[PDB]
């Protein structure tokens, strides 16, 4: 139920380090309306407040739906965002 918008894709790269730190190796990155969005489905051993709290350090909440993002946004990384990023950066 989690989707954050991000100022730049770099905030997602940076975020990725923290998410990987906390065992969250997934994530789905969308590009929509000139912004990047991350959607997380599995929070690992973590709560929503936990992961969101860290999400907020890197991005801002969005009122978007995953529907809006999946039918109208660009799918950059499906379900392996963090590991794809961490596996490069």
Swiss-Prot record:
Record-stated family: Belongs to the MecA family.
Domain commentary: The N-terminal domain has binding sites for ComK and probably for unfolded/aggregated proteins; the C-terminal domain interacts with ClpC.
Function: Enables the recognition and targeting of unfolded and aggregated proteins to the ClpC protease or to other proteins involved in proteolysis. Also involved in Spx degradation by ClpC. Acts negatively in the development of competence by binding ComK and recruiting it to the ClpCP protease. When overexpressed, inhibits sporulation.
Oligomeric form and interacting partners: Homodimer.
Protein name: Adapter protein MecA 2
Gene, per the UniProt record: mecB
């Amino acid at each position: 139920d989690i989707i954050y918008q991000f100022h730049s894709f770099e905030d997602i790269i940076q975020l990725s380090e923290s998410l990987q730190r906390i065992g969250i190796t997934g994530g789905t990155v969308y590009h929509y309306d000139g912004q990047y969005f991350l959607s997380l489905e599995d929070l690992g051993s973590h709560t929503a407040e936990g992961v969101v709290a860290v999400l907020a350090e890197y991005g801002n909440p969005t009122t978007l739906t995953i529907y809006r993002l999946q039918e109208y946004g660009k799918l950059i990384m499906d379900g392996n965002a963090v590991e794809t990023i961490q596996t490069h950066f």
